[PDB]
Amino acid sequence: STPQDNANTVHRYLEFVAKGQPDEIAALYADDATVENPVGSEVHIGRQAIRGFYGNLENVQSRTEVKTLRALGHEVAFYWTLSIGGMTMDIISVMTFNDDGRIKSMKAYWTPENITQ
Amino acid sequence: STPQDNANTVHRYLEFVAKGQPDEIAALYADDATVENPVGSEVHIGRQAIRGFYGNLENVQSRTEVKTLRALGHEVAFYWTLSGMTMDIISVMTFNDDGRIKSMKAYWTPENITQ
Ligand SMILES: O=[N+]([O-])c1ccc(O)cc1[N+](=O)[O-]
Ligand SMILES: O=[N+]([O-])c1ccc(O)cc1[N+](=O)[O-]
Secondary structure, eight states: OOHHHHHHHHHHHHHHHHHTOHHHHHHHEEEEEEEESSTTSOOEESHHHHHHHGGGGTTOOOEEEEEEEEEETTEEEEEEEEEEOOEEEEEEEEEEEOTTSOEEEEEEEOOGGGEEO | OOHHHHHHHHHHHHHHHHHTOHHHHHHHEEEEEEEESSTTSOOEESHHHHHHHGGGGTTOOOOEEEEEEEEETTEEEEEEEEOOOEEEEEEEEEEOTTSOEEEEEEEOOGGGEEO
16 A cells, blocks of 8 residues: 555544444454554454454544644554543554555554643 | 653653764664664664764754653654754654663654744
8 A cells, every 4th residue: 555545544544533433443454453552551463352442432422633644654653632522632643554555553652641621 | 671761762862863973872772773764764774774874963963852752661652853944753762671772763754844
């Protein structure tokens, strides 16, 4: 996939997050993808584990905003906000992508000190 | 190493960059570290190659400023500016058990350069 494709995929990830659609999120990930959210916690491996992880977003209506996004090589680094309610999280994320454009890995860098309001 | 010590290493690195100290930069990296700057370009592998990469900073004076830094596990993600021009960069470093930098990746393009 191209960097443009991967940027597009990030935008659809953020769409499905904002809509509370874990099935649509999980479908963006590769069968053997990894999710580390937050970085430092035990990695979730494979689509089944990833779908379970995202299950709590079911039927949650949130908003997202991309502050900056850099799609380079097979990777996308993006700095973005997630607003639920409420509370606004300030997140640095990195995703990497397989040859078929599905997400191979995601890492999210934030703590409660990046949550406001 | 602890996240607090890795955060410290990032601060040391950014000052060695600001001051133009490539040998001191190289010393912060592990002997088999990797540098990918920018992401998408050929990786620089091993401290000797990394020292050569940074060689253009020798005695070059710049300014660096951290916007936000998150030290988590054995990683640090940081959003920062390098300054004429100013570059806003997203960087990720990972660290070995002994606190040396195992890997660095820098995410920026000329679109992130403003007057
Ligand atoms: O912690 N979080 O809420 C979070 C952080 C980064 C993400 O890519 C997604 C989520 N989420 O599950 O909504
Ligand atoms: O733009 N650059 O060359 C750059 C980007 C990220 C860095 O951590 C350091 C440098 N530098 O040594 O100047």
